Amino acid sequence: VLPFGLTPKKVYKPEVQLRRPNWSKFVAEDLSQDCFWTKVKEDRFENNEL
Amino acid sequence: ETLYKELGDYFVFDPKKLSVEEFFMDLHNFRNMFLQAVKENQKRRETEE
């Protein structure tokens, strides 16, 4: 059970390993209640052609 | 100090240890790089045409 009602993210399985950017990620414990990152609805941008 | 603390609650950005000019510079440099990348894509499409 993630904090602030968050669902777990979609774990992708690419066939080819890609070049990746390596940032310092924020977990759901690092986020606050009224932040931008709890309201992220990125699955509307999902496309298999992309 | 209150309005900067009001900025510290909307975006968190570690408010105890964050200067203000470094955060605005990275937003400015990303803004100039994204505007350069759009014009480079327009120049690449003009060359490919």
Q: Do A8 and A27 contact (CB within 8 A), yes or no? A: no
Report the gap between the CA of A24 and the closest CA in chain B (Å). 13
Is the CB of A29 inside 8 Å of chain B's CB atoms? no
The method recorded for this entry reads cryo-EM
B38 conformational bin, left if phi > 0, alpha if psi -120 to 50, beta if neither: alpha
Residues in chain B closer than 8 A to A31 (CB atoms): 12
Resolution, angstroms, 1 dp: 3.4
Q: Which amino acid is at B31?
A: R
Count of H-run helices and E-run strands, chain A:
0, 0
